[model samples]
Target chain A: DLQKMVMGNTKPVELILDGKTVAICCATGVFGTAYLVPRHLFAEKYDKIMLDGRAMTDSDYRVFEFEIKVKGQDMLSDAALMVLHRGNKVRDITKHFRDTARMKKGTPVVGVVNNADVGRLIFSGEALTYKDIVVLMDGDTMPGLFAYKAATRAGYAGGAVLAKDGADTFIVGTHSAGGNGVGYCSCVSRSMLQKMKAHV
Target chain B: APAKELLNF
Candidate 1:
């Protein structure tokens, strides 16, 4: 009934990523759940990660996919990996997890990324914090940056960078590992990242 | 009276 009445259908969005057009569904609802996808795909970049704000204690990892409601539309393409590092100068998440998360030695903390193109931008060793990441992403096409600062404020552990050509606004959102990131991005315009910077 | 009254009361 909810799907039939409130949440109508799987709204499709065409993403032109790395010169390829991929059809990804945008969920139509006020809130949608984040699902766990396989992690082996992301092993090269983020070898370590946290799950739902706690350091992942297993070698196995996965990305949490969810929906972000932007401009009255639900974009289901957003996904996130819970990580501890949020500094300038990109370091492998493994190093930060080893240094900051205060886990016991030999504790496994691995993560996987679904999209290779977006994964590279997130793990790019340049900026340390999310504010710096926004600037970094702003300069590039389809940049996926970290959002630990704002995510912490919003009671989540991760965020995503998202934009589309010929669209009036850029969208960013916070996500939780437990299958349900926020169903909406509070800022809904081109200035959303700036709004996120103001918030963080 | 004391014992009886106390018991009764």
Candidate 2:
């Protein structure tokens, strides 16, 4: 299931404001039993994001939530790490590490962002290599996340970009906030590894 | 030089 397990929300998540679709939250389908989503995806500041229900709070640079019968802590999320709290429900997730993002040029990758339409979430392709890219979006410039030259549209910021170095299937990065027609897609970059500081 | 930025973005 490596191809399917790379990155995604397993389903579409709608960021809503007054019951209207504002943005989409791309959860790392396999980041863990919990859900590893992007903080910047909520940068617009909204009422709530909903799949089946609203996303509840969890942490710094990240968020946590539990949809169980009960919990002492169903999932431990911190930006990149989404450790599941429930023992019975740790499914569809992965253990992404620092080296996971270490991809060289020509490393074939596929980034998936579920574009929420009236009926379903479409896959906005997130793509590219390890080279630094100049991303101009919403008056911001991300000079480094791997640029795929692959087309990314509005609302797919948190999508995970997957790559397999040689031995194992790994991740390059998750899409940072963009979609202002910059036409470039990137991840949080290999550098955020330090920011995580074992937070992963 | 604009001071080389870190590849860590």
For each candidate, what is chain B's TM-score? 0.07, 0.36
The reply for model 1, stretches above 4 Å from the true place, is: A1-44, A57-59, A64-78, A81-138, A143-200, B1-9
Model 2 segments more than 4 A misplaced: A7-9, A30-33, A52-92, A118-135, A177-200, B1-9
Best by TM-score: 2
lDDT of 1 by residue, A8-60 (tens): 21111222333443221122111122222211113223323322222232333
lDDT of each residue in A100-192, candidate 2, tens digit only: 346665556566555353223333333444434343433443433555544454445556666657765666555554333222333443334
Question: What docking class should model 1 receive?
Answer: incorrect
Writing each residue's lDDT as its tens digit, candidate 2 over B1-9 gives: 111111111
True interface contacts reproduced by each model, as a fraction? 0.00, 0.00
Per-candidate TM equals 0.19, 0.59
| Residues forming the 10-long window of minimal summed lDDT in candidate 2 chain A | A68-77
Interface RMSD, every prediction, one decimal place:
37.6, 11.1
